[PDB]
Ligand binder design. Sequence first.
Ligand SMILES: *[C@@H]1O[C@H](CO)[C@@H](O[C@@H]2O[C@H](CO)[C@@H](O[C@@H]3O[C@H](CO)[C@@H](O)[C@H](O)[C@@H]3O)[C@H](O)[C@H]2NC(C)=O)[C@H](O)[C@H]1NC(C)=O
Ligand SMILES: *[C@@H]1O[C@H](CO)[C@@H](O[C@@H]2O[C@H](CO)[C@@H](O[C@@H]3O[C@H](CO)[C@@H](O)[C@H](O)[C@@H]3O)[C@H](O)[C@H]2NC(C)=O)[C@H](O)[C@H]1NC(C)=O
Ligand SMILES: *[C@@H]1O[C@H](CO)[C@@H](O[C@@H]2O[C@H](CO)[C@@H](O)[C@H](O)[C@H]2NC(C)=O)[C@H](O)[C@H]1NC(C)=O
Ligand SMILES: *[C@@H]1O[C@H](CO)[C@@H](O[C@@H]2O[C@H](CO)[C@@H](O)[C@H](O)[C@H]2NC(C)=O)[C@H](O)[C@H]1NC(C)=O
Ligand SMILES: *[C@@H]1O[C@H](CO)[C@@H](O[C@@H]2O[C@H](CO)[C@@H](O)[C@H](O)[C@H]2NC(C)=O)[C@H](O)[C@H]1NC(C)=O
Ligand SMILES: *[C@@H]1O[C@H](CO)[C@@H](O[C@@H]2O[C@H](CO)[C@@H](O)[C@H](O)[C@H]2NC(C)=O)[C@H](O)[C@H]1NC(C)=O
Ligand SMILES: *[C@@H]1O[C@H](CO)[C@@H](O[C@@H]2O[C@H](CO)[C@@H](O)[C@H](O)[C@H]2NC(C)=O)[C@H](O)[C@H]1NC(C)=O
Ligand SMILES: *[C@@H]1O[C@H](CO)[C@@H](O[C@@H]2O[C@H](CO)[C@@H](O)[C@H](O)[C@H]2NC(C)=O)[C@H](O)[C@H]1NC(C)=O
Ligand SMILES: *[C@@H]1O[C@H](CO)[C@@H](O[C@@H]2O[C@H](CO)[C@@H](O)[C@H](O)[C@H]2NC(C)=O)[C@H](O)[C@H]1NC(C)=O
Ligand SMILES: *[C@@H]1O[C@H](CO)[C@@H](O[C@@H]2O[C@H](CO)[C@@H](O)[C@H](O)[C@H]2NC(C)=O)[C@H](O)[C@H]1NC(C)=O
Ligand SMILES: *[C@@H]1O[C@H](CO)[C@@H](O[C@@H]2O[C@H](CO)[C@@H](O)[C@H](O)[C@H]2NC(C)=O)[C@H](O)[C@H]1NC(C)=O
Ligand SMILES: *[C@@H]1O[C@H](CO)[C@@H](O[C@@H]2O[C@H](CO)[C@@H](O)[C@H](O)[C@H]2NC(C)=O)[C@H](O)[C@H]1NC(C)=O
Ligand code: NAG
Ligand code: NAG
Ligand code: NAG
Ligand code: NAG
Ligand code: NAG
Ligand code: NAG
Ligand code: NAG
Ligand code: NAG
Ligand code: NAG
Ligand code: NAG
Ligand code: NAG
Ligand code: NAG
Ligand code: NAG
Ligand code: NAG
Ligand code: NAG
Ligand code: NAG
Ligand code: NAG
Ligand code: NAG
Ligand code: NAG
Ligand code: NAG
Lengths: 126, 126, 126, 441, 441, 103
Amino acid sequence: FLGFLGAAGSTMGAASMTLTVQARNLLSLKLTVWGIKQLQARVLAVERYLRDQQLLGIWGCSGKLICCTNVPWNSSWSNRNLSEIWDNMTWLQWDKEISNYTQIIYGLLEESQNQQEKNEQDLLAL
Amino acid sequence: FLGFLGAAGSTMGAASMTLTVQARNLLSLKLTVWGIKQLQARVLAVERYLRDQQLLGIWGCSGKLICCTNVPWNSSWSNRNLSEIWDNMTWLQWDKEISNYTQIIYGLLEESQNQQEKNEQDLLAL
Amino acid sequence: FLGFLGAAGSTMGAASMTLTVQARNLLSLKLTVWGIKQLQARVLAVERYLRDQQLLGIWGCSGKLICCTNVPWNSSWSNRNLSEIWDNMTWLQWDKEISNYTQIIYGLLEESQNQQEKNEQDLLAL
Amino acid sequence: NLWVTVYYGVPVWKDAETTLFCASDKHNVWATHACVPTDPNPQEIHLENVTEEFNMWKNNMVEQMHTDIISLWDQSLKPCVKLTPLCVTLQCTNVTNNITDDMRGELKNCSFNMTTELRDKKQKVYSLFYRLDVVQINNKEYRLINCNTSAITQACPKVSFEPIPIHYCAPAGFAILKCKDKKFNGTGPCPSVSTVQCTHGIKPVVSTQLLLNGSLAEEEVMIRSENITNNAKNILVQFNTPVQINCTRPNNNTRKSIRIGPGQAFYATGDIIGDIRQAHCNVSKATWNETLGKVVKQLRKHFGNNTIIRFANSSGGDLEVTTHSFNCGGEFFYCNTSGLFNSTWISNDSITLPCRIKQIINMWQRIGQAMYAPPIQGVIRCVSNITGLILTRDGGSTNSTTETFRPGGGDMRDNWRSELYKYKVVKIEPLGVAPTRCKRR
Amino acid sequence: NLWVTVYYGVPVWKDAETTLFCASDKHNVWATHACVPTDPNPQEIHLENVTEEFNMWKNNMVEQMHTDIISLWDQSLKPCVKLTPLCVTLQCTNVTNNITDDMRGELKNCSFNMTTELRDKKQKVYSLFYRLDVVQINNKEYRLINCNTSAITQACPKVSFEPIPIHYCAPAGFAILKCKDKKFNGTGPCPSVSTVQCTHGIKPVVSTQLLLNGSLAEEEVMIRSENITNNAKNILVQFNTPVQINCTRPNNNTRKSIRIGPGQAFYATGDIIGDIRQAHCNVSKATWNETLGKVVKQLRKHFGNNTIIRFANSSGGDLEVTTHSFNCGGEFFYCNTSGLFNSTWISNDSITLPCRIKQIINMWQRIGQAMYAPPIQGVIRCVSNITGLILTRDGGSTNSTTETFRPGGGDMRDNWRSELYKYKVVKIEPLGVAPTRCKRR
Amino acid sequence: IQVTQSPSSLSASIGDTITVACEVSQDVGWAVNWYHQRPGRPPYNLIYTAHNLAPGVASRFRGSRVGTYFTLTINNLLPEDVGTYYCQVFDSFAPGGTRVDLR
Ligand SMILES: *[C@@H]1O[C@H](CO)[C@@H](O[C@@H]2O[C@H](CO)[C@@H](O[C@@H]3O[C@H](CO)[C@@H](O)[C@H](O)[C@@H]3O)[C@H](O)[C@H]2NC(C)=O)[C@H](O)[C@H]1NC(C)=O
Ligand SMILES: *[C@@H]1O[C@H](CO)[C@@H](O[C@@H]2O[C@H](CO)[C@@H](O[C@@H]3O[C@H](CO)[C@@H](O)[C@H](O)[C@@H]3O)[C@H](O)[C@H]2NC(C)=O)[C@H](O)[C@H]1NC(C)=O
Ligand SMILES: *[C@@H]1O[C@H](CO)[C@@H](O[C@@H]2O[C@H](CO)[C@@H](O)[C@H](O)[C@H]2NC(C)=O)[C@H](O)[C@H]1NC(C)=O
Ligand SMILES: *[C@@H]1O[C@H](CO)[C@@H](O[C@@H]2O[C@H](CO)[C@@H](O)[C@H](O)[C@H]2NC(C)=O)[C@H](O)[C@H]1NC(C)=O
Ligand SMILES: *[C@@H]1O[C@H](CO)[C@@H](O[C@@H]2O[C@H](CO)[C@@H](O)[C@H](O)[C@H]2NC(C)=O)[C@H](O)[C@H]1NC(C)=O
Ligand SMILES: *[C@@H]1O[C@H](CO)[C@@H](O[C@@H]2O[C@H](CO)[C@@H](O)[C@H](O)[C@H]2NC(C)=O)[C@H](O)[C@H]1NC(C)=O
Ligand SMILES: *[C@@H]1O[C@H](CO)[C@@H](O[C@@H]2O[C@H](CO)[C@@H](O)[C@H](O)[C@H]2NC(C)=O)[C@H](O)[C@H]1NC(C)=O
Ligand SMILES: *[C@@H]1O[C@H](CO)[C@@H](O[C@@H]2O[C@H](CO)[C@@H](O)[C@H](O)[C@H]2NC(C)=O)[C@H](O)[C@H]1NC(C)=O
Ligand SMILES: *[C@@H]1O[C@H](CO)[C@@H](O[C@@H]2O[C@H](CO)[C@@H](O)[C@H](O)[C@H]2NC(C)=O)[C@H](O)[C@H]1NC(C)=O
Ligand SMILES: *[C@@H]1O[C@H](CO)[C@@H](O[C@@H]2O[C@H](CO)[C@@H](O)[C@H](O)[C@H]2NC(C)=O)[C@H](O)[C@H]1NC(C)=O
Ligand SMILES: *[C@@H]1O[C@H](CO)[C@@H](O[C@@H]2O[C@H](CO)[C@@H](O)[C@H](O)[C@H]2NC(C)=O)[C@H](O)[C@H]1NC(C)=O
Ligand SMILES: *[C@@H]1O[C@H](CO)[C@@H](O[C@@H]2O[C@H](CO)[C@@H](O)[C@H](O)[C@H]2NC(C)=O)[C@H](O)[C@H]1NC(C)=O
Ligand SMILES: *[C@@H]1O[C@H](CO)[C@@H](O)[C@H](O)[C@H]1NC(C)=O
Ligand SMILES: *[C@@H]1O[C@H](CO)[C@@H](O)[C@H](O)[C@H]1NC(C)=O
Ligand SMILES: *[C@@H]1O[C@H](CO)[C@@H](O)[C@H](O)[C@H]1NC(C)=O
Ligand SMILES: *[C@@H]1O[C@H](CO)[C@@H](O)[C@H](O)[C@H]1NC(C)=O
Ligand SMILES: *[C@@H]1O[C@H](CO)[C@@H](O)[C@H](O)[C@H]1NC(C)=O
Ligand SMILES: *[C@@H]1O[C@H](CO)[C@@H](O)[C@H](O)[C@H]1NC(C)=O
Ligand SMILES: *[C@@H]1O[C@H](CO)[C@@H](O)[C@H](O)[C@H]1NC(C)=O
Ligand SMILES: *[C@@H]1O[C@H](CO)[C@@H](O)[C@H](O)[C@H]1NC(C)=O
Ligand SMILES: *[C@@H]1O[C@H](CO)[C@@H](O)[C@H](O)[C@H]1NC(C)=O
Ligand SMILES: *[C@@H]1O[C@H](CO)[C@@H](O)[C@H](O)[C@H]1NC(C)=O
Ligand SMILES: *[C@@H]1O[C@H](CO)[C@@H](O)[C@H](O)[C@H]1NC(C)=O
Ligand SMILES: *[C@@H]1O[C@H](CO)[C@@H](O)[C@H](O)[C@H]1NC(C)=O
Ligand SMILES: *[C@@H]1O[C@H](CO)[C@@H](O)[C@H](O)[C@H]1NC(C)=O
Ligand SMILES: *[C@@H]1O[C@H](CO)[C@@H](O)[C@H](O)[C@H]1NC(C)=O
Ligand SMILES: *[C@@H]1O[C@H](CO)[C@@H](O)[C@H](O)[C@H]1NC(C)=O
Ligand SMILES: *[C@@H]1O[C@H](CO)[C@@H](O)[C@H](O)[C@H]1NC(C)=O
Ligand SMILES: *[C@@H]1O[C@H](CO)[C@@H](O)[C@H](O)[C@H]1NC(C)=O
Ligand SMILES: *[C@@H]1O[C@H](CO)[C@@H](O)[C@H](O)[C@H]1NC(C)=O
Ligand SMILES: *[C@@H]1O[C@H](CO)[C@@H](O)[C@H](O)[C@H]1NC(C)=O
Ligand SMILES: *[C@@H]1O[C@H](CO)[C@@H](O)[C@H](O)[C@H]1NC(C)=O
């Protein structure tokens, strides 16, 4: 145990081993300046958490810290070897080098989830 | 792709094919008039989303855009043929002609989910 | 049917039969004193619901009213017989006599869920 | 066999009421700086196959925006000097140097004792007040017309009254439906409905008879009224072409600052450089005649072809309704629009409208509080578009076809509803249940 | 073959701006009671392997907390008596009874007509005003200095200006990064970064030339200044050791309550018991010389070893800048401080600083509002820590190595940036995508 | 718009049920307010919107709409109901009204 963002500089695998400790800290009067700032901060935190939770929910991964999908990884995003990625890299650089391709990945995730769920319904009905 | 409410006038199947685009738009300073109006609007939006997600969760369908269940169609709510419904009808008229029976359907969903979950516990323990 | 907190004094099994009715009531203008009190109450209700939802999500039990885990019962928290607990006790006393061991149980649930998910990752990969 | 299946994100909406926040693309009386920055590229989506009922009158947006504008107007005067010491006996003499025929007695040269910085000490100063601001007491003794009914707070000179377009955006989970029908009269179904995140540029212009700087009709001048039969509901007219209107205040006004207390400054009206003329609004005679011809052509339809349509001036009432009042560059005009609504219709030149100025302005008719608009230095001049009418019909004798229409207004909701006419607020309901052959596991 | 695997809770952060709420461990000006009670044991976490970029000069936190301080200062003033009647003609005489040579003419014994409880009835009362608060009018006639350019509101006597430490805490989903590097030069990467839930005790001390009660540098005196070659950017000096300063006002003042209206009390200055001396501050000569030696040693690095460093006093300007101004037990000082920056450097005793006191205080330079600090009963004595300086370099000819540094200040953001220098606000982004051999079933 | 009423006058004994007609020339929706005027007394509101009772009016009064044909129906007639009945549409009042007196 290291704490909130304890494994920030760790390798990929070690950081993924302790996702919960960072996962549990995203969520936790009069009209005075301090009071209104407190209320704004509270609402901002709750909205950010629900944006993240909804974004997970669209990809059919709600409630799962690590969830797999069915979209292939085009090597244009990153062709690095897995051993180098998961043993000699931190999450910071990883987000640094895929900041631009994030949106298309999210769209592929959404489309794949929708199609897979429709196929599951078709199989369940028959 | 059409966008938010793009398939509002389309048929049932086409609308169901693109549920995500409407799903993803359901969630996305001083004490000035515009500031307080903005804050109230933000809180209203977040609470409406949370209520909808809670209603989905009670029926054991959280995280699933299209979810089926185990309560029969009473056939008094509507006796229309499936082909006519899913090929020559839009969601607007469907909700228009089923609005009064929504509460009992929700209650049936609730009871069915609770009983199914209890049965799953019982068979899981044995 | 009894209503919100209807089976508060009932036995364990009867209370567990009707979790849904207390589950639904957990979530449901100018800068006037009444207005600001209403707004703060609304935000407080939203966050109180979301903390519980997050706690359920971390343990891999989101969307399930009853969820089983892989945390053994230490028998030091309570060694009482199952028949006595589930037929001759109310939830209030049960929470009364485990008020101190709650945090360690929550931590065990969190760690057990995390390891369980990563174990699944290995099998889904291989 | 059959079973029900729950759906998330279905395109289903219901009519609902909600709070709308502003978005907009020097300080302003409307806090546009408090608006969230709108997206440079608005998203608009066409909803084919959709037929939605619309109704400007039962629309909440007009009432909500009336409330919003009143709130902004009230808020913009809270950090402004209160002119309670101005309620002092005045000694006013008519200004009669370099004045024209129409300027006899419209301006008064009033001198009064006023509190200086030092409380015990006093000072005699003079100011120029228009005849409509001062009332005689029975040279002569005058007082500000407000003094026996209200207390004024001077509008802060640095805030601009110019209208800035502002977009009213619904929160998440709500949508705004924009009626794309070009022949939509405002009631009944709108076959072409397109949704947008929020409204186009709405300028909250403050006018009574002629709607300035508004949105034009796409194809033809249209007539929109709740019950045309009822000779009381105002007839909202929207022009398909703009009628340019020019007008200015020829006086070379000077703003003289008078300190009436600690950090409190009252901006008076100094001597005018040069001759003193009349503020007057210009409208092209031929353009106005053509627009009136189009209006009467489209109006005959609602009634009959053989009926006589006659435009007469305002019958009477307070100055705001009788005339055409509107703020121009920080000054409030009151224009005597009698030369416009004068023609009678049967099946280069400009019209000069003599306007009158007022400084003590009481908009929204608030009981107890009114405004003193500070004078604007220099010669103010604004070029606006006449984009609409507000006509009130007069009940006939049930014996003649001489329908008489007169300008109306006063109710600013009528002025504003010509801009929110094509919009509607709906509540997204994304939970749907439908029968399908699926079964849970 | 590879596939994408979503991850929740990854330790990824981006630089971002957000609202920070207060937390802290008699009513006070900063309303620290409104701050949430901080945890008795802060959660401080060390993030090694991490190198994060830092920049105090473009940090939001300084601007945000400056805005917070101004808002608090304004809000603590609203429910306080408004001293508009005090702006009345004064009859002031020299206070020459039991005064020293340096006190000649600094006090004024002003007597004035003041309104009483009964509005019609007037009243004559006298009070003592410092020479910097009253200006002659051309015994003689005087007035309060800001009665022709601002409104004076008395600070409520029962609220204390003493700085209570406040912690700025970010909301959930945000983190505060603390640069643990003891050699952080004020910008660039910080090799040893650590996160904390929120900041340590920050005292919003008000000072211009010397930093009072600040946080010490851990190892050595540090010189931090964006673009040090720019001879207009203030140089933030931080001391590794504290220089004790003793400030006192020997006068035994009496607070005389003068009722100027219904429930409104203006707290005046009565007769002083005993001799009247000059309020002064004391700094140890040897300690100050040693600190200056350390500062000049650390300052030769950025300019060269052979250069001459000379400290002259602050150049012309307003009183708050030309002097070392601060608050001491409810009173605002203005200290000479020419004996501090007095020497030149080439490769038991105390320094008495004659301070002047002011009651009319206009902090933040707001247009129209000024504050009247009520007098403090008894002799006030303050023991503070000189923990920093605001040095402004001066340009020179190309033939001179005599770099002259003078005390600066005024911009309180420079006073406060020395306390938020090692902190930063980041936004947690817990969603990550990584390639794994797993494919959803 | 011309508005007509019929019959011009009528006499009913105690307790009878009587109705009065108010015909409109054009579509007026339901805007046909009714007013009763006791002899020597100012008129007061009976029915607004053509079917809604004014405050203080007994439930024994009823109004209805048949297209452009409008009726005010009175049950169990009582002595205080004597007087004249007027129907208003916008700015138009029926000429003469309808006089109701005891038999
Ligand atoms: C309808 O829209 C037109 C066009 O925006 C408005 O005309 C503008 O009115 C403002 C009023 O002050 C003029 O601003 C002035 O501009 C001069 C230019 O030198 C400047 O020196 C003044 O200090 C002042 O800012 C502006 O020039 C004028 N024209 C344009 C193109 O903006 C008109 O006022 C609007 N209608 C109403 C009723 O406000
Ligand atoms: C820097 O910090 C020091 C200590 O935190 C400040 O000295 C303190 O100053 C306050 C008032 O300014 C003193 O409180 C007063 O004490 C007297 C005598 O006990 C009492 O009669 C008053 O009612 C009030 O409580 C406090 O004693 C004093 N602390 C000491 C001397 O250790 C100093 O003012 C700060 N520098 C600033 C704010 O510039
Ligand atoms: C006022 O009317 C003038 C025209 O007299 C507008 O100027 C242009 O008018 C043409 C004619 O349709 C439009 O195509 C242009 O788009 C207008 N210019 C701009 C910049 O939009 C002018 O915009 C009108 N001002 C208003 C409505 O405020
Ligand atoms: C005149 O105005 C009345 C105002 O109510 C209109 O009446 C309503 O019309 C709507 C039309 O959809 C109906 O749904 C309502 O039930 C009507 N109610 C009432 C109180 O009448 C009327 O239609 C208008 N008609 C004309 C000729 O303009
Ligand atoms: C409005 O129009 C009138 C005339 O219709 C203008 O008045 C004339 O202005 C010119 C200068 O531009 C003078 O030389 C004339 O003596 C004026 N009177 C007449 C009868 O021509 C007036 O300037 C216009 N105002 C505007 C455009 O703001
Ligand atoms: C209102 O003023 C505008 C100018 O501010 C007038 O437009 C001018 O019209 C004349 C004659 O047609 C042209 O020669 C100018 O080039 C125009 N100036 C422009 C367009 O900037 C307009 O005619 C005036 N309208 C009225 C009714 O007086
Ligand atoms: C509408 O026009 C009529 C006539 O065109 C105006 O009647 C005049 O009113 C003034 C009072 O200001 C009288 O001195 C005149 O004798 C009237 N002329 C008549 C009766 O022919 C009337 O004032 C106008 N109403 C407005 C402009 O609101
Ligand atoms: C508004 O305009 C009308 C018409 O120009 C004015 O009515 C004229 O008033 C003068 C005296 O002010 C009379 O001599 C005329 O006989 C009136 N009629 C006409 C056709 O000129 C009216 O006075 C103006 N002002 C107001 C306030 O209505
Ligand atoms: C600051 O130091 C000066 C001396 O450098 C102190 O002045 C002396 O004060 C004592 C009283 O404690 C007197 O008896 C001496 O006569 C004073 N000497 C002078 C004026 O030369 C002064 O008190 C100190 N101030 C503090 C400690 O606040
Ligand atoms: C400022 O005042 C404090 C206390 O009044 C001084 O601290 C005292 O210093 C003397 C030496 O002169 C010691 O004997 C005492 O034991 C100290 N007492 C405390 C409580 O610290 C301090 O020296 C003064 N500093 C200056 C520069 O005048
Ligand atoms: C910095 O030091 C200089 C010189 O010691 C001060 O200059 C003196 O200013 C006063 C004005 O109060 C004059 O009466 C003296 O004649 C000046 N002495 C000179 C020029 O040698 C200067 O005032 C000091 N700075 C401050 C802010 O006090
Ligand atoms: C700040 O202090 C310095 C030195 O203590 C003052 O400069 C002296 O002022 C006196 C008063 O006129 C002169 O007689 C001296 O010649 C000045 N120089 C020196 C070296 O003593 C300066 O005036 C003070 N600043 C003020 C009072 O604002
Ligand atoms: C920091 O780096 C060292 C060497 O690269 C490594 O052994 C250590 O595990 C890293 N820190 C963490 C928390 O992983
Ligand atoms: C509208 O209806 C027509 C005919 O029923 C259909 O072909 C068309 O696809 C519909 N619109 C959309 C957007 O599906
Ligand atoms: C209360 O207790 C009795 C016996 O202890 C039990 O029979 C009864 O069901 C309980 N009440 C409820 C509401 O269950
Ligand atoms: C108004 O009267 C003052 C004297 O009280 C005079 O100085 C000024 O010129 C007058 N202004 C006019 C006549 O416009
Ligand atoms: C001054 O103007 C008034 C109108 O307000 C008028 O009644 C009076 O006769 C005028 N006096 C003159 C011109 O001497
Ligand atoms: C100001 O007061 C004096 C005092 O008598 C008076 O003579 C003078 O007329 C006053 N000036 C006004 C009322 O303008
Ligand atoms: C104010 O004075 C005017 C005349 O100057 C009068 O007509 C009006 O009724 C007065 N209002 C009051 C006394 O409320
Ligand atoms: C507007 O058009 C609809 C079309 O059905 C019609 O019913 C309605 O009466 C029209 N309204 C007006 C004011 O003409
Ligand atoms: C108005 O007067 C000023 C002098 O105060 C002059 O500079 C300016 O040019 C004048 N404006 C006009 C339009 O004559
Ligand atoms: C406007 O047009 C009508 C058309 O009949 C004409 O009678 C009238 O003289 C015209 N007015 C003008 C051109 O000013
Ligand atoms: C209105 O028209 C009549 C004739 O049609 C004319 O005599 C009168 O002057 C006009 N009014 C104006 C131009 O104000
Ligand atoms: C009174 O005090 C002033 C200080 O502003 C001084 O200039 C003046 O010489 C003093 N006069 C006497 C007589 O003491
Ligand atoms: C100030 O003057 C008053 C008389 O107006 C006197 O009573 C008081 O003692 C004086 N205070 C001094 C000289 O300090
Ligand atoms: C108060 O007013 C009286 C009235 O004349 C005056 O004599 C006295 O000097 C005033 N007191 C002051 C200005 O302090
Ligand atoms: C206020 O009075 C001071 C006295 O010196 C003067 O310098 C300043 O200009 C005045 N401010 C004004 C008149 O606005
Ligand atoms: C601070 O240190 C960094 C380390 O790379 C350097 O780039 C920067 O110039 C330094 N800033 C100074 C010395 O002001
Ligand atoms: C001042 O410095 C001393 C160390 O000499 C320290 O004990 C004291 O707490 C400091 N006072 C502050 C930081 O207010
Ligand atoms: C100040 O004066 C009061 C009497 O008013 C006295 O009790 C106190 O001791 C004095 N303070 C000093 C430091 O002499
Ligand atoms: C400061 O100390 C240094 C070295 O101890 C000495 O050379 C210098 O003269 C001293 N200056 C003062 C003002 O004490
Ligand atoms: C500044 O330093 C010089 C040289 O030591 C000295 O003569 C002068 O008095 C000093 N200024 C002061 C102490 O104010």
